[PDB]
Design an enzyme around this catalytic site. Structure first.
Site, PDB file in Angstrom:
ATOM      1  N   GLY B   9       1.078  -4.499 -12.097  1.00 44.50           N
ATOM      2  CA  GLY B   9       0.683  -3.241 -11.465  1.00 44.50           C
ATOM      3  C   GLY B   9       1.473  -3.321 -10.008  1.00 44.50           C
ATOM      4  O   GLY B   9       1.821  -4.205  -9.646  1.00 44.50           O
ATOM      5  N   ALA B  11       0.949  -1.614  -7.526  1.00 44.21           N
ATOM      6  CA  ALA B  11      -0.131  -2.146  -6.426  1.00 44.21           C
ATOM      7  C   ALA B  11      -0.244  -3.402  -6.482  1.00 44.21           C
ATOM      8  O   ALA B  11       0.019  -4.114  -5.480  1.00 44.21           O
ATOM      9  CB  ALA B  11      -1.418  -1.366  -6.987  1.00 44.21           C
ATOM     10  N   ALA B  71       6.341   3.453 -18.758  1.00 44.03           N
ATOM     11  CA  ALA B  71       5.332   2.821 -17.549  1.00 44.03           C
ATOM     12  C   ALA B  71       3.877   2.793 -18.232  1.00 44.03           C
ATOM     13  O   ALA B  71       3.263   2.006 -18.017  1.00 44.03           O
ATOM     14  CB  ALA B  71       5.469   3.929 -16.477  1.00 44.03           C
ATOM     15  N   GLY B 118      -1.545  -1.562 -15.410  1.00 48.42           N
ATOM     16  CA  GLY B 118      -2.064  -2.904 -15.145  1.00 48.42           C
ATOM     17  C   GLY B 118      -3.486  -2.952 -15.345  1.00 48.42           C
ATOM     18  O   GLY B 118      -4.292  -3.274 -14.541  1.00 48.42           O
ATOM     19  N   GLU B 155      -7.786   8.834 -13.571  1.00 48.45           N
ATOM     20  CA  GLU B 155      -8.371   7.776 -12.603  1.00 48.45           C
ATOM     21  C   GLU B 155      -9.691   7.207 -13.248  1.00 48.45           C
ATOM     22  O   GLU B 155      -9.808   5.998 -13.286  1.00 48.45           O
ATOM     23  CB  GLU B 155      -8.846   8.576 -11.304  1.00 48.45           C
ATOM     24  CG  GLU B 155      -9.290   7.114 -10.348  1.00 48.45           C
ATOM     25  CD  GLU B 155      -8.256   6.298  -9.801  1.00 48.45           C
ATOM     26  OE1 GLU B 155      -7.095   6.844  -9.706  1.00 48.45           O
ATOM     27  OE2 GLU B 155      -8.600   5.147  -9.396  1.00 48.45           O
ATOM     28  N   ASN B 178      -9.079   1.510  -1.340  1.00 55.00           N
ATOM     29  CA  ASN B 178      -8.364   2.077  -0.045  1.00 55.00           C
ATOM     30  C   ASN B 178      -9.026   2.910   1.003  1.00 55.00           C
ATOM     31  O   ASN B 178      -8.635   2.515   2.211  1.00 55.00           O
ATOM     32  CB  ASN B 178      -7.490   3.159  -0.769  1.00 55.00           C
ATOM     33  CG  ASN B 178      -6.192   3.350   0.016  1.00 55.00           C
ATOM     34  OD1 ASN B 178      -6.056   3.049   1.001  1.00 55.00           O
ATOM     35  ND2 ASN B 178      -5.158   4.445  -0.561  1.00 55.00           N
ATOM     36  N   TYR B 196       0.838   1.875   2.520  1.00 56.66           N
ATOM     37  CA  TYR B 196       0.550   0.662   1.504  1.00 56.66           C
ATOM     38  C   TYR B 196       1.018  -0.740   2.240  1.00 56.66           C
ATOM     39  O   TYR B 196       0.363  -1.792   1.930  1.00 56.66           O
ATOM     40  CB  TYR B 196       1.047   1.188   0.287  1.00 56.66           C
ATOM     41  CG  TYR B 196       0.333   2.113  -0.591  1.00 56.66           C
ATOM     42  CD1 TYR B 196      -0.755   2.674   0.019  1.00 56.66           C
ATOM     43  CD2 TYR B 196       0.862   2.782  -1.651  1.00 56.66           C
ATOM     44  CE1 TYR B 196      -1.438   3.798  -0.731  1.00 56.66           C
ATOM     45  CE2 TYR B 196       0.352   3.803  -2.290  1.00 56.66           C
ATOM     46  CZ  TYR B 196      -1.031   4.321  -2.073  1.00 56.66           C
ATOM     47  OH  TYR B 196      -1.631   5.413  -2.406  1.00 56.66           O
ATOM     48  N   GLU B 226     -17.312 -24.202  -6.613  1.00 53.17           N
ATOM     49  CA  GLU B 226     -18.378 -23.979  -5.723  1.00 53.17           C
ATOM     50  C   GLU B 226     -18.549 -22.577  -5.270  1.00 53.17           C
ATOM     51  O   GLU B 226     -19.254 -22.593  -4.182  1.00 53.17           O
ATOM     52  CB  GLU B 226     -18.676 -25.071  -4.628  1.00 53.17           C
ATOM     53  CG  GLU B 226     -18.927 -26.602  -5.264  1.00 53.17           C
ATOM     54  CD  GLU B 226     -20.230 -26.977  -5.301  1.00 53.17           C
ATOM     55  OE1 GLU B 226     -21.155 -26.285  -5.063  1.00 53.17           O
ATOM     56  OE2 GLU B 226     -20.443 -27.746  -6.279  1.00 53.17           O
TER      57      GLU B 226
HETATM   58  N1  LIG Z   1      -3.757  -0.530  -1.636  1.00 57.38           N
HETATM   59  C1  LIG Z   1      -2.819  -0.164  -2.304  1.00 57.38           C
HETATM   60  N2  LIG Z   1      -3.046   0.652  -3.444  1.00 57.38           N
HETATM   61  C2  LIG Z   1      -1.787   1.009  -4.130  1.00 57.38           C
HETATM   62  C3  LIG Z   1      -0.571   0.407  -3.844  1.00 57.38           C
HETATM   63  N3  LIG Z   1       0.407   1.009  -4.716  1.00 57.38           N
HETATM   64  C4  LIG Z   1      -0.432   1.836  -5.701  1.00 57.38           C
HETATM   65  N4  LIG Z   1      -1.663   1.588  -5.312  1.00 57.38           N
HETATM   66  C5  LIG Z   1      -2.877   2.377  -5.898  1.00 57.38           C
HETATM   67  O1  LIG Z   1      -3.242   1.539  -7.095  1.00 57.38           O
HETATM   68  C6  LIG Z   1      -3.093   2.327  -8.272  1.00 57.38           C
HETATM   69  C7  LIG Z   1      -2.276   1.295  -9.410  1.00 57.38           C
HETATM   70  O2  LIG Z   1      -0.953   1.541  -9.118  1.00 57.38           O
HETATM   71  P1  LIG Z   1       0.115   1.682 -10.386  1.00 57.38           P
HETATM   72  O3  LIG Z   1       1.362   2.136 -10.035  1.00 57.38           O
HETATM   73  O4  LIG Z   1      -0.511   3.144 -11.205  1.00 57.38           O
HETATM   74  O5  LIG Z   1      -0.026   0.501 -11.247  1.00 57.38           O
HETATM   75  P2  LIG Z   1      -0.166   0.493 -12.878  1.00 57.38           P
HETATM   76  O6  LIG Z   1      -1.551   0.983 -13.136  1.00 57.38           O
HETATM   77  O7  LIG Z   1       0.215  -1.010 -13.405  1.00 57.38           O
HETATM   78  O8  LIG Z   1       0.896   1.699 -13.244  1.00 57.38           O
HETATM   79  P3  LIG Z   1       2.607   1.774 -12.934  1.00 57.38           P
HETATM   80  O9  LIG Z   1       2.884   2.927 -12.380  1.00 57.38           O
HETATM   81  O10 LIG Z   1       3.213   1.591 -14.601  1.00 57.38           O
HETATM   82  O11 LIG Z   1       2.711   0.288 -12.139  1.00 57.38           O
HETATM   83  C8  LIG Z   1      -2.354   3.433  -7.992  1.00 57.38           C
HETATM   84  O12 LIG Z   1      -3.017   4.427  -8.703  1.00 57.38           O
HETATM   85  C9  LIG Z   1      -2.501   3.628  -6.571  1.00 57.38           C
HETATM   86  O13 LIG Z   1      -3.351   4.732  -6.313  1.00 57.38           O
HETATM   87  C10 LIG Z   1      -0.413  -0.237  -2.640  1.00 57.38           C
HETATM   88  O14 LIG Z   1       0.512  -0.746  -2.430  1.00 57.38           O
HETATM   89  N5  LIG Z   1      -1.514  -0.637  -1.950  1.00 57.38           N
HETATM   90 MG   LIG Z   2       1.932   0.005 -10.341  1.00 60.06          MG
END
Ligand SMILES: Nc1nc2c(ncn2[C@@H]2O[C@H](COP(=O)(O)OP(=O)(O)OP(=O)(O)O)[C@@H](O)[C@H]2O)c(=O)[nH]1
Ligand SMILES: [Mg+2]
Ligand SMILES: CC(=O)O[C@H]1C(=O)[C@@]2(C)[C@H]([C@H](OC(=O)c3ccccc3)[C@]3(O)C[C@H](OC(=O)[C@H](O)[C@@H](NC(=O)c4ccccc4)c4ccccc4)C(C)=C1C3(C)C)[C@]1(OC(C)=O)CO[C@@H]1C[C@@H]2O
Ligand SMILES: Nc1nc2c(ncn2[C@@H]2O[C@H](COP(=O)(O)OP(=O)(O)O)[C@@H](O)[C@H]2O)c(=O)[nH]1
Ligand SMILES: Nc1ncnc2c1ncn2[C@@H]1O[C@H](COP(=O)(O)OP(=O)(O)O)[C@@H](O)[C@H]1O
Ligand SMILES: [Mg+2]
Lengths: 426, 411, 327
Positions: B9, B11, B71, B118, B155, B178, B196, B226
């Site tokens: 992901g 994130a 993606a 992810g 979401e 968040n 972020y 543990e």
């Molecule tokens: N705290 C935090 N949250 C994040 C960050 N980047 C993304 N997010 C949140 O986490 C969610 C997951 O990120 P995604 O980019 O969608 O990851 P994914 O589900 O694997 O989908 P992809 O875009 O293909 O990577 C997003 O919807 C954002 O709202 C970050 O750097 N920090």
């Molecule tokens: Mg992502």
């Protein structure tokens, strides 16, 4: 990931012309010349809209289609008229008549298979294909008939990728072709079964922005195509750069539409300023969050406030904070929250790139879907069925293979397409 | 064994980027050993972030995994076909890391629910790890959906289908959101640009308070195994909440007559714990702590006393005491580009509460509203799903909230 | 001229091979009470309930004989074969059934043409012409079953100014006898037995379309009636998930067509939703049932239900589908 581009129609030709003339300047491409970006950041993902051949040339993987050689001869003699491989020019010498059915039955079928040959040459030319960019207009069988004939053979050929449709719907009060609006019904009859994404564009909103909000008096078409080019450039390669949170076409496809009736889109470019005077220290997402969501800065002919909202697809770019993204989006989720229909809780989609544009420090791009397009296609349906009745200059189409039942089925398809939005406005 | 980890992901990849920067600074890791983990994503760009400039030179690059396909942010497409082409290479690389390690400890999992990419790849990855290495430690952290600060249109549906794979494939699980981290960055960090790149520093700070210099050279260990039978009441894989307390600035917050007890009592204040699970009615079943810096354990068995004698933060009736005290000698470490505190003692916490079902109601009713009109179903049918999996996910969350209803406050 | 929906329920008797594995029953048909005991608790009422001792002439006299008068009075008529693959849809329609040799074992299709000519010569005052059309629908495409081949990309749908469904590229034969009907349906089934003359890859998973049509004209009042023989796909649902790469589009066809049809009938389920938008435009078999579903048309629902307990939950899904749509 790889995408090619379609040009149909003279308006679609001008749109594609100014689009390549913008997007090659974003990557730093001299016309004959090569990459000249002072960072390497403009170079890292150039496999999307280009193909390497000699280290100097970077050919735009695009399609050049017209029913008249003079328009594309004017293109190839213009500013970037050397950047195209001239075999990609595909054209007949026949008439570019304004019949939809001329471009869809006979005088397009003389030129379908060459276009199929070019797209089969260029699809599997290279690595895994991602999507298709259709730029055309409804005001010509070039764009209306041959355009839908192309993509209707494409979706039976390729059931996999994404069909970005950039259409030019004729504005109702400024209708610069009196014999037009049959082609709109015939076009939209066979758009709603083939594509997935249609960003419908209306000229009168462009005149509204550049002529009222911008104080530039002369509405030269280069500025209109310049704005549409900026609009589409804030979509795809913006999401194909490094970004904090980046999306693709397919994410916006899953986000925006409820149903697989594919539910057409409304584009919007945020920062619009008078040429030098409008330096105002009002530069943030916030000013742009307000600038996107007004009755102006909306390329639909219809008023987008008049009706609900389905999905806000916002595209941001520039070094910026996500907390003051989501906070502004919560303000939009609370102020206009009556016509921001409630049962879909999140109506917002966020697209964040890292890079700014070439000169501006921060910019944004809005993509929208409202119920207000009901009160644009109802108006097109009214202008259709008004002068459908008297028939006296309708017999151009009959001898071209068009039959009587086709118009009425097109009417019913477009009309219950209006009726589902008549439902979901409440 | 340093809990060879996985990340997936954008994130997850960026949160591992900042977390891994904190890792490679807190031991004095020069850019000249081996990165002990893997980075997998279905988009090559987010991985090519690290594969361009900083830490590209550090890593042997022959061991990170990308997907050149779409993606695909939807649980159906992310779990099924478009993620099928990547899972085997990931499995072979993590079994290579399982072979090269000797007496490993477990798996810390960093992903998110916010987007299907992810989530479903994560789901069958955890499933195949339960098939392969199920007699190990499975810790998972995912970023929880927001109740109203949400970003993705789609979401709920991802997280709703993800509540099955977090049940029967891990035991301890962390779900930090968040929203109250933005509240921290406004209130206690005292800046007005939350990006972020700082939230990732905060989660990297809390995981660096869990694991790294504890296990690597040093001698006062507190075990992961543990935890996983010292944090669930009953072996339904429940969901504790972790919170890093001393989030104050090293710039403006010069309250430099500071002791352990302030941030210790601030581990139990409601509006600081990075999720909307305040003890309005949620009660405490287990509150294992980890301290790092300087410890007079009189502070430990006096803060525990003064929390015990409040009768406002009432514990579980049947659970008599549920504490376990982590004491580590080494302080946290401040990244020069970061914002954290540089304080000679620091306290992270973690605890499992009752009111996780409140956030589950926030997610559940949000799911049922768009489920009622059959909203986005055609994509998930287009990648091979059914109504029955939605029904099983709904009754899965119903069973989870009934389990939190009985075994929690009720005696 | 607008009428509500009529429902017929028929159980088939048990086939041998579905009993040879050691299966038993799960039903208790109550013909007077109008429902059944599925398992122990499931008691689902209907309009016309028939046990597993029913012939084709019993369903014919029960439902098609009121349909024939309305078809000979200018109203549209439609019967459709819903049910499990093997539950007897082909037996229920019985388009000129042969192999089932006995006279009570062929279906409605020879019977309607046997009863047409008794009133065709009597209705010689009005202009009365009967023409037929036999088609197949598969892979979201068409097939002219009166033809050895015509490209489905070349055959599309239409709609007239009055507001009804119009076809093109379809062979029409003005019929004058049962011999032409059963000859073209012998040929129709002889050129699409497994599915448009091709290796059976679940040819019963497709849809097939047949239509009888009578006009009315004397001062020239043009009210044309149709007697549709719709033959649907199977009621079952295939999970299919990984079969051949990405080629589960057959599951996409039947699942999209029956979720669309389910949203249509569930839009008739809630009376709040029957003023809403009916999504005919999601599927071709839904668009061909547009004017058939209500309006001036006549509708009899038949869902071939299974007697044995081996088909317990699938017949439950069938009864849930008919209780949501059976009306
Ligand atoms: N705290 C935090 N949250 C994040 C960050 N980047 C993304 N997010 C949140 O986490 C969610 C997951 O990120 P995604 O980019 O969608 O990851 P994914 O589900 O694997 O989908 P992809 O875009 O293909 O990577 C997003 O919807 C954002 O709202 C970050 O750097 N920090
Ligand atoms: Mg992502
Ligand atoms: C230093 C600087 O930014 O000056 C700008 C400028 O001041 C403004 C007025 C520009 C100016 O643009 C317009 O006024 C305009 C005219 C017709 C249609 C649309 C716009 C500018 O023309 C636009 C242009 O801005 C850009 O360079 C962007 O990167 C732009 N690229 C091009 O316009 C371009 C130029 C040559 C060849 C190909 C493309 C862009 C931005 C986003 C997406 C696509 C393109 C330039 C330097 C300026 C002027 C000339 C005044 C603005 O427009 C754009 C798209 O940038 C309008 O407000 C924005 C930003 C500025 O306020
Ligand atoms: N904004 C804009 N619209 C244009 C331009 N050129 C044409 N159009 C519009 O596009 C419509 C159809 O043009 P098009 O079909 O491409 O011309 P054709 O190919 O020769 O038939 C016309 O009604 C015009 O209003 C242009 O340069 N800018
Ligand atoms: N109610 C019934 N009475 C007598 N025979 C039946 C009945 N239902 C089905 N059959 C027999 O079962 C055989 C196969 O059924 P079929 O109609 O092909 O099922 P479906 O068309 O629903 O897949 C037919 O040849 C038919 O003779
Ligand atoms: Mg059969």
């Amino acid at each position: 990931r790889e995408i090619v581009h379609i040009q149909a129609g003279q308006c679609g030709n001008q749109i594609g012309a100014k689009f390549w003339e913008v997007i090659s300047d974003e990557h730093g491409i001299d016309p004959t010349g090569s990459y000249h970006g002072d960072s390497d950041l403009q170079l890292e993902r150039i496999n999307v809209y280009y193909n390497e051949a000699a280290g100097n040339k970077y050919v735009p993987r695009a399609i050049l289609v017209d029913l008249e050689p003079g328009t594309m001869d004017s293109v190839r003699s213009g500013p970037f008229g050397q950047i195209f491989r001239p075999d990609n020019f595909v054209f007949g010498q026949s008439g570019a008549g304004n019949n939809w059915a001329k471009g869809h039955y006979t005088e397009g079928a003389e030129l379908v298979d060459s276009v199929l040959d070019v797209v089969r040459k260029e699809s599997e030319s290279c690595d895994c294909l991602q999507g298709f960019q259709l730029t055309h207009s409804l005001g010509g069988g070039t764009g209306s008939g041959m355009g839908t004939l192309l993509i209707s053979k494409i979706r039976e050929e390729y059931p996999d990728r994404i069909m970005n449709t950039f259409s030019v719907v004729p504005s109702p009060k400024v209708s610069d072709t009196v014999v037009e609006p049959y082609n709109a019904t015939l076009s939209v009859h066979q758009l709603v079964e083939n594509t997935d994404e249609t960003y419908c564009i209306d000229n009168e909103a462009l005149y509204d922005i550049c002529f009222r909000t911008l104080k530039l008096t002369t509405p030269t078409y280069g500025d209109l195509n310049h704005l549409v080019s900026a609009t589409m450039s804030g979509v795809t390669t913006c999401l194909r750069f490094p970004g904090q949170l980046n999306a693709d076409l397919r994410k916006l496809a899953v986000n925006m539409v409820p149903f697989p009736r594919l539910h057409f889109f409304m584009p919007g470019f945020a920062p619009l300023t008078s040429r030098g005077s409008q330096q105002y220290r009002a530069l943030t997402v916030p000013e742009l969050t307000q600038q996107m969501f007004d009755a102006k800065n909306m390329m639909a002919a219809c008023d987008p406030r008049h009706g609900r909202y389905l999905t806000v697809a916002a595209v941001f770019r520039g070094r910026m904070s996500m907390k003051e993204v989501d906070e502004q989006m919560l303000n939009v989720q609370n102020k206009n929250s009556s016509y921001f229909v409630e049962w879909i809780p999140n109506n917002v989609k966020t697209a964040v790139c890292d890079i700014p544009p070439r000169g501006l420090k921060m910019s944004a791009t809005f993509i929208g879907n409202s119920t207000a397009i009901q009160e644009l296609f109802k108006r097109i349906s009214e202008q259709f069925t008004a002068m459908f009745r008297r028939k006296a200059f309708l017999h151009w189409y009959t001898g071209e293979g068009m039959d009587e039942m086709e118009f009425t089925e097109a009417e019913s398809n477009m009309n219950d397409l209006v009726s589902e939005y008549q439902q979901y406005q409440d | 064994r340093e809990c060879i980890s996985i990340h997936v992901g954008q994130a997850g990849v960026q949160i591992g980027n900042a977390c891994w920067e904190l890792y490679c600074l807190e031991h004095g890791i020069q850019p000249d050993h081996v990165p002990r983990a893997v980075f997998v994503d279905l988009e090559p760009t987010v991985i090519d972030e690290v594969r361009t400039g900083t830490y590209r030179q550090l890593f042997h690059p022959e061991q990170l995994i990308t997907g050149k396909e779409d993606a695909a942010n939807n649980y159906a497409r992310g779990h099924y076909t478009i993620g099928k082409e990547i899972i085997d290479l990931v499995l072979d690389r993590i079994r290579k890391l399982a072979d090269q390690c000797t007496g490993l400890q477990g798996f810390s999992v960093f992903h998110s629910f916010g987007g299907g990419t992810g989530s479903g790849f994560t789901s069958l990855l955890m499933e195949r790890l339960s098939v392969d290495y199920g007699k190990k430690s499975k810790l998972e952290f995912s970023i929880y959906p927001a109740p109203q600060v949400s970003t993705a249109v789609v979401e709920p549906y991802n997280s709703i289908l993800t509540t099955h794979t977090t049940l029967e494939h891990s035991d301890c699980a962390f779900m930090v959101d968040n929203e109250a981290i933005y509240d921290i960055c406004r209130r206690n960090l005292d800046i007005e640009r939350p990006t972020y790149t700082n939230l990732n520093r905060l989660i990297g700070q809390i995981v660096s308070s869990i694991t790294a210099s504890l296990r690597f050279d040093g001698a006062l260990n507190v075990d992961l195994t543990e935890f996983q039978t010292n944090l669930v009441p009953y072996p339904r894989a429940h969901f504790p909440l972790a919170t890093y307390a001393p989030v104050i600035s090293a710039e403006k917050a010069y309250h430099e007559q500071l002791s352990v007890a302030e941030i210790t009592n601030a581990c139990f204040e409601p509006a600081n714990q990075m999720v909307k699970c305040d003890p309005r009615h949620g009660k405490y079943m287990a509150c294992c702590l980890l301290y790092r810096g300087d410890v007079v354990p009189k502070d430990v068995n006096a803060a525990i006393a003064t929390i015990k004698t409040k009768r406002t933060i009432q514990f579980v009736d049947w659970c008599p005491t549920g504490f376990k005290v982590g004491i580590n000698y080494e302080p946290p470490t401040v990244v020069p580009g970061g914002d954290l505190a540089k304080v000679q003692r620091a306290v992270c916490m973690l605890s499992n509460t009752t009111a996780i079902a409140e956030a589950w109601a926030r997610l559940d009713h949000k799911f049922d509203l768009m489920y009622a009109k059959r909203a986005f179903v055609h994509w998930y049918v287009g990648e091979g799903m059914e109504e029955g999996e939605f029904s099983e996910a709904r009754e899965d969350m119903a069973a989870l909230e009934k389990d939190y209803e009985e075994v929690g406050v009720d005696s | 001229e607008e009428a509500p929906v009529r429902v017929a329920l028929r159980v088939r008797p048990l086939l041998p091979k579905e009993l040879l594995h050691g299966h038993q029953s799960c039903l208790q048909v109550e013909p007077g009470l109008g429902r059944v005991t599925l398992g122990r608790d499931r008691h689902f009422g209907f309009h016309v309930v028939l046990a597993e001792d029913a012939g084709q002439e019993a369903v014919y006299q029960a439902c098609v004989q009121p349909l024939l008068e309305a078809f000979f009075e200018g109203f549209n008529a439609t019967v459709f074969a819903y049910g499990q693959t093997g539950s007897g849809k082909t037996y229920t329609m019985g388009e000129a059934s042969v192999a089932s040799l006995l006279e009570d074992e062929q279906g409605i299709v020879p019977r309607a043409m046997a009863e047409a000519f008794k009133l065709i010569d009597e209705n010689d005052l009005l202009d009365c012409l009967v023409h037929v059309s036999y088609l197949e629908v598969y892979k979201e495409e068409f097939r002219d079953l009166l033809e050895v081949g015509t490209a489905s990309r070349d055959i599309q749908l239409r709609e007239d100014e009055r507001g009804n469904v119009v076809l093109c590229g379809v062979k029409e034969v003005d019929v004058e006898g049962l011999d032409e009907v059963l000859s073209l349906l012998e040929m129709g089934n002889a050129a699409r037995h497994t599915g448009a003359t091709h290796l059976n890859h679940l040819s019963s998973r497709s849809h097939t379309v047949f239509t009888v049509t009578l006009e009315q004209r004397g001062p020239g009042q043009l009210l044309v009636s149709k007697f549709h023989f719709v033959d649907l796909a199977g009621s079952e649902r295939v999970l299919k998930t990984g079969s051949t790469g990405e080629r589960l589009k057959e599951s996409i066809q039947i699942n999209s067509s029956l979720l669309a049809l389910g949203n249509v009938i569930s839009a008739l389920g809630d009376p709040q939703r029957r003023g809403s938008h009916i999504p005919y435009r999601d599927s071709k078999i839904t668009r061909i049932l547009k004017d058939s579903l209500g309006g001036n048309a006549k509708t009899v629902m038949i869902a071939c239900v299974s007697p044995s307990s081996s088909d317990f939950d699938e017949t439950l899904n069938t009864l849930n589908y008919a209780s949501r749509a059976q009306n």
